């Protein structure tokens, strides 16, 4: 005989997901989908690696401000499907 | 084709 039972209409171990880009000004891009607390640096390390560059040689921005190694889609107050920007730097050389 | 990476941040044995 069948071992059947109805299951209760709650699912407490869910979380929220959000879709973020990381985009360079060479038009180079990665789509990601992360939980609303997941750190943005995990996305920005992987971008920087597939480009081959040192994370040191680059700045990052969103909605008018910098991103830190700990900012989250909660911390920045982000709505879904947005873009993070990446940027180069130009110190040294002949003055 | 590979412009896609999937990421979360809680881990344990």
Swiss-Prot record, chain A:
Gene3D superfamilies: Phosphatidylinositol 3-kinase Catalytic Subunit, Chain A, domain 1 (3.10.20.90). Keywords: Acetylation, Host-virus interaction, Isopeptide bond, Nucleus, Ubl conjugation, Ubl conjugation pathway. Polymeric chains can be formed through Lys-11 cross-linking. Polymeric SUMO2 chains undergo 'Lys-6'-, 'Lys-11'-, 'Lys-48'- and 'Lys-63'-linked polyubiquitination by RNF4. Changing residue 11 to R: Abolishes the formation of poly(SUMO) chains. It comes from the Eukaryota. Residues 16-95 form the Ubiquitin-like domain. There is a cross-link at residue 11 (Glycyl lysine isopeptide (Lys-Gly) (interchain with G-Cter in SUMO)). There is a cross-link at residue 11 (Glycyl lysine isopeptide (Lys-Gly) (interchain with G-Cter in ubiquitin)). One of its GO terms (cellular component) is GABA-ergic synapse. There is a cross-link at residue 11 (Glycyl lysine isopeptide (Lys-Gly) (interchain with G-Cter in SUMO1)). There is a cross-link at residue 1 (Peptide (Met-Gly) (interchain with G-Cter in ubiquitin)). Residues 94-95 form a propeptide. GO terms for biological process: positive regulation of proteasomal ubiquitin-dependent protein catabolic process; positive regulation of transcription by RNA polymerase II; protein sumoylation. This is Small ubiquitin-related modifier 2. It comes from Homo sapiens (Human). The lineage of its organism: Eukaryota, Metazoa, Chordata, Craniata, Vertebrata.
Swiss-Prot record, chain B:
Expressed in testis, ovary, thymus and heart. Expressed in germ cells of the testis. Belongs to the RAP80 family. Transmembrane segments: none annotated. The tandem UIM domains form a continuous 60 Angstrom-long alpha-helix and mediate binding to 'Lys-63'-linked ubiquitins. UIM1 and UIM2 bind to the proximal and distal ubiquitin moieties and recognize an 'Ile-44'-centered hydrophobic patch. Since UIMs don't interact with the 'Lys-63' isopeptide bond the UIM-linker region between the 2 UIM domains determines the selectivity for 'Lys-63'-linkage, and its length is very important for specificity. The Abraxas-interacting region (AIR) mediates the interaction with ABRAXAS1. Sumoylated. It comes from the Eukaryota. Component of the ARISC complex, at least composed of UIMC1/RAP80, ABRAXAS1, BRCC3/BRCC36, BABAM2 and BABAM1/NBA1. Component of the BRCA1-A complex, at least composed of the BRCA1, BARD1, UIMC1/RAP80, ABRAXAS1, BRCC3/BRCC36, BABAM2 and BABAM1/NBA1. In the BRCA1-A complex, interacts directly with ABRAXAS1. Interacts with UBE2I. Interacts with NR6A1. Interacts with ESR1. Interacts with TSP57. Interacts with TRAIP. This is BRCA1-A complex subunit RAP80. The modification Phosphoserine is found at residues 8, 10. It is found in: Nucleus.
């Amino acid at each position: 005989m069948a071992d059947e039972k109805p299951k209760e209409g709650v699912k407490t171990e869910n979380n929220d997901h959000i879709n973020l880009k990381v985009a360079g000004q060479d038009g180079s891009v990665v789509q990601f989908k992360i939980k609303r607390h997941t750190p943005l640096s995990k996305l920005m390390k992987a971008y920087c690696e597939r480009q081959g560059l040192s994370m040191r040689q680059i700045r990052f921005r969103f909605d008018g401000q910098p991103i830190n190694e700990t900012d989250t889609p909660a911390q920045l107050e982000m709505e879904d499907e947005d873009t993070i920007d990446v940027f180069q730097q130009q110190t040294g050389g002949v003055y | 084709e590979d412009a896609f990476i999937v990421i979360s941040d809680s881990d344990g044995e």
